Write a protein that binds this ligand. Structure first.
Ligand SMILES: OC[C@H]1O[C@H](O[C@@H]2[C@H](O)[C@@H](O)O[C@H](CO)[C@H]2O)[C@H](O)[C@@H](O)[C@@H]1O
Length: 924
């Protein structure tokens, strides 16, 4: 039974919450922090200066260097460090060798670009109470630094949007020695969960208040079982009483509707209102808490006699490290997320297969079990791409081995899968069994690659294998070593279709405090674990990612790695899932806001365990879960060890038939999924998109988190996630025409509204927005790889403008040849009775030399076009005219007139145009 720190039980949380209580209750609180104005210089997109913190009654100060950077992107950055610790002028307790510097390598792990300073940024005004810097797009952005008390207002369009230290909560815990007097009860040793943190540095937390002025909704800081629009944390009806926490942890049977930490953390928050968006990224790898309150701008936020405009107050604090924050001024959600991704990276180009359906449990028990499931899925016409092996495949929980009794012929298993282009995923976790006759542990120890305790001994604790050590993936030599262990001729029983799942990388330690490592463990660089905890999981996923790039000579190819724990930047390395969820309706419902929050925080490749991990879902629940799951970018069924087998062919009729139809829908849309992942790769566009993102002008959209748009398609989904619901109310965001994907019934035209839609068990509620084109593949196949050369259908969805656009991206799904132009990317435009296809980027034909994959694609066609909302002037016309590659011909079209609420639509068959070429098709 699992104990979790509440705020009051975390020392530095208590002190920052108490600092906040004092400041908001004190009369004319002033933050005891001031810029020494004569220390301050501006040059070349950068202010630097010394803040002086007054630390006592006698007016004694310490020096904290400030750097405000103004980047070419129009993003700003604010860093505050501690001069005394930069210089090494402190003493650690216990003769600790822990680093004295404030942790400063989060940047190195996370930030991959966007750091160029804007030499167009300039001082506009400065007296010696303040200075205003103009920066960004034609100098539209301003930051007003106030010197005494320190504060910054970030403005655009003549208003303040974000304020730092307006409430005076800035708090940098300066180093002090442990002395008795001539409340410090949390400053030093702290005990929790059977462990005592020796706390060699003492207090060193960093915190700040960040106000979002005139914003009522904030979003982000996944992962939490919480709504997408984040809740208040200081009490009130339907609010939380604790701050949101980010401390990656193994949270068994995590509850719904809670600010408690889960497995991964991305400290990126956005605020949105009608036609305005801003955001911040709090670049800190330590335990981090965020309090949120909303109210009027007065000190009593319920006061009368003041303006009613709401400001959202947030209060961030982390255990150690630099105070280090980026500020994004938007002004759209797209802008903000795009800038974040430039900083932290876009989604990696995925293995195409990994967008298929993944089949998993704890555990498939033999190579005969695997092979029998593969054959059963084919028997029941349930397509899938990957079958997954959990920890029981190992030899007594040693990674890089197999249980030879149960997994006789792993290579044969692999090859049976290879006959349908299917794949195998095996689990590898970061704990390495402490035992005899095990080369992997010997090398870990002998090469000094393990995480260490507070005195430099090798750390030891308990997980699956019993007594274990943990790889320190912060250490580049540990990463380089790990690479070597995955070569096909080193890791026996694996081969070219074997990929990897990392879990327990929080890290999970069964006998540790809060099921993780002590805070005073030491990592490569001599950083304390407290400094880097939230990066740990990402270091390990990174190690594994780079290991799969090349596993034999000649090979260079896209990794696929699933992780449990993560940080800002993990999008570069693979997928995540939301951990050990539960087989209950509430968890199915919660999955959607969680997965949305992932993508709007720049890590869209995300999902939850279909069916729920713990327990046994009813058959209707499981069926609904498939209908939701087909819209997770990462779509996997998984089940705990005590749960019954529930491979989907075991459900029974009519559930089997409905689940198979969900699967077929996912597979038919794979062309559009893959394209959505392409855009996530190009600029960090989310793969599924909430209403606030797609419709920033529609205020009613802000709190909506149960429906979403898919990629670029205009498809709007609202899965049923309530027991015995047989209809669904979909919020229609705007005035465009929306059609039922299945019947083409007109759900709305002309007016934003809530529309009621029939939704029995066999129905997936899915609408097609007018103005869009999207591609699918109609021919059903057993896996994604067997679709690779099938023809495409294009769906052209027209509203009253009779105009549409969309796109389609393809490549080999596996190599890095996309980096040299080996891909097809089409833009489809419908206008003035004409559908055209052009290169999305406007490349000329051969300036690119065709490789082997592009040549094969010459046999692949668009064969079918469906126009929904077909105009009446096409009635009685029985051909269209097709032009492509110099040739012109006629193709048959059937016009079907409107009928009841069913739209007019038209179908062109046997179009016969190669997907890689320009074309023009004239209707009417
Ligand atoms: O590899 C097995 C299993 O491990 C993780 O889950 C476990 C599990 O829920 C339970 O036994 O409790 C521990 C401690 O909290 C968890 O770590 C993975 O999350 C899961 O997907 C996997 O099947």
């Amino acid at each position: 039974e699992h104990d979790w720190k509440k705020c009051d039980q975390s020392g530095f949380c208590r002190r920052n919450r108490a600092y906040a209580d004092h400041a908001l209750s004190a009369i004319s609180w002033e933050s005891p922090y001031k810029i020494a104005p004569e220390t301050g210089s501006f040059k070349d997109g950068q202010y630097q200066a010394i803040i002086l913190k007054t630390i006592n009654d006698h007016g004694e100060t310490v020096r904290l260097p400030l750097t405000v950077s103004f980047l070419e992107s129009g993003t700003a950055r604010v860093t505050i460090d501690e001069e005394k610790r930069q210089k090494g002028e402190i003493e650690l307790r216990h003769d600790s060798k822990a680093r004295k510097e404030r942790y400063n390598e989060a940047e190195q792990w996370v930030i991959v670009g966007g750091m160029t300073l804007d030499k167009g940024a300039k001082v506009d005004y400065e007296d010696k109470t303040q200075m205003t810097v103009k920066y960004g797009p034609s100098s539209k952005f301003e930051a007003t630094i106030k010197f005494a008390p320190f504060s910054i207002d970030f403005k655009r369009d003549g208003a303040s949007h974000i304020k730092f230290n307006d409430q005076g909560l800035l708090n940098i815990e300066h180093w002090r020695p442990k002395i008795d007097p001539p409340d410090d009860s949390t400053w030093w040793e702290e005990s929790f969960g059977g462990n005592t943190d020796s706390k060699p540095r003492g207090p060193e937390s960093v915190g700040l208040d960040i106000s979002f002025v005139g914003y009522e909704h904030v979003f982000g800081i996944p992962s939490h079982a919480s709504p997408l629009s984040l809740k208040q944390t200081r009490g009130g009806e339907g609010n939380y009483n604790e701050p949101y926490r980010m401390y990656n942890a193994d949270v068994f049977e995590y509850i719904l509707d809670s600010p408690m930490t889960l497995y991964g953390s991305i400290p990126f928050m956005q605020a949105h209102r009608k036609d305005s968006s801003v955001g911040i990224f709090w670049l800190n790898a330590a335990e981090t808490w965020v309090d949120i309150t909303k109210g009027k701008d007065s000190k009593n936020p319920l006061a009368l006699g003041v303006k009613s405009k709401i400001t959202t107050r947030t209060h961030w604090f982390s255990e150690s490290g630099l105070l280090d924050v980026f500020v994004f001024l938007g002004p759209t959600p797209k802008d903000i997320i795009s800038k974040y991704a430039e900083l932290t990276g876009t989604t990696a180009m995925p293995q195409e297969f990994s967008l298929g359906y993944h089949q998993c449990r704890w555990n498939y028990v033999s190579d005969e079990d695997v092979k029998d499931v593969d054959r059963k899925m084919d028997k029941f016409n349930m397509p899938y791409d990957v079958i997954w092996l959990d920890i029981e495949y190992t030899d007594e929980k040693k990674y890089f081995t197999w249980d030879k009794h149960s997994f006789k012929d792993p290579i044969g298993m692999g090859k049976q899968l290879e006959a349908h282009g299917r794949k195998l995923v095996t689990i590898i976790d970061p704990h390495i069994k402490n035992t005899n006759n095990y080369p992997v542990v010997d090398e870990l120890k002998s090469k000094d690659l393990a995480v260490k305790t507070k005195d430099g001994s090798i750390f030891e604790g308990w997980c699956w294998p019993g007594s274990s050590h943990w790889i320190d993936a912060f250490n580049p030599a540990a990463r380089e070593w790990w690479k070597g262990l995955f070569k096909y001729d080193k890791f026996k029983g694996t081969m070219e279709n074997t990929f990897i799942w990392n879990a327990m990388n929080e890290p999970s330690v069964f006998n540790g405090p809060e099921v993780t490592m002590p805070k005073d463990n030491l990592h490569h660089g001599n950083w304390e674990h407290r400094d880097v905890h939230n990066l740990n999981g990402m270091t390990f996923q990174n190690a594994t990612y780079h290991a799969l790039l090349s596993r034999k000579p000649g090979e260079h190819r896209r990794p696929f790695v699933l992780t449990r724990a993560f940080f800002a930047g993990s999008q570069r390395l693979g997928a995540m899932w939301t951990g050990d969820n539960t087989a209950d309706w509430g968890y199915l419902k919660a999955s959607i806001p969680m997965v949305l929050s992932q993508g709007i925080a720049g890590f869209p490749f995300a999902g939850a365990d279909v069916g729920g991990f713990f327990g046994n879902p009813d058959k209707d629940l499981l069926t609904r879960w498939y209908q939701t799951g087909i819209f997770y970018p990462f779509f996997r069924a998984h089940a705990h060890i005590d749960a019954r087998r529930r491979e989907p062919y075991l459900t029974g009729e009519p559930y089997n038939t409905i689940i198979a139809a969900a699967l077929r829908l996912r597979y038919s849309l794979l062309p559009s999924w893959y394209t959505a992942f392409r855009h996530a790769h190009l600029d960090g566009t989310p793969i599924i998109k909430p209403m606030f993102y797609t419709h920033p002008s529609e205020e009613a959209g802000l709190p909506i988190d149960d429906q979403f748009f898919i990629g670029n398609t205009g498809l709007l989904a609202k899965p049923v996630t309530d027991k015995d619901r047989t209809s669904v109310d979909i919020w229609i965001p705007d005035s465009e025409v929306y059609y039922d994907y299945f019947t083409y019934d007109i759900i709305s035209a002309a007016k934003s509204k809530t529309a009621t839609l029939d939704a029995p068990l066999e129905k997936i509620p899915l609408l097609m927005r007018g103005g869009h084109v999207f591609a699918r593949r109609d021919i059903p196949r057993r896996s994604s790889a067997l679709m690779k050369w099938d023809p495409y259908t294009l769906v052209v969805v027209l509203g009253n403008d009779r105009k549409a656009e969309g796109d389609l991206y393809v490549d080999d799904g596996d190599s890095f040849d996309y980096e040299k132009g080996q891909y097809i990317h089409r833009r489809f435009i419908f206008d003035a009775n004409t559908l055209t296809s052009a290169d999305y980027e406007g490349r000329d034909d051969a300036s690119i030399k065709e490789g082997e994959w592009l040549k094969k694609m010459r046999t692949v066609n668009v064969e079918k076009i469906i126009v929904v909302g077909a105009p009446a002037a096409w009635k009685g016309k029985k051909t269209v005219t097709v032009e492509s590659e110099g040739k012109t011909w006629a193709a048959a079209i059937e016009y079907n007139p409107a009928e009841k609420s069913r739209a007019a639509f038209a179908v062109v068959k046997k179009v016969g145009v190669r997907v890689g070429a320009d074309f023009k098709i004239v209707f009417g």
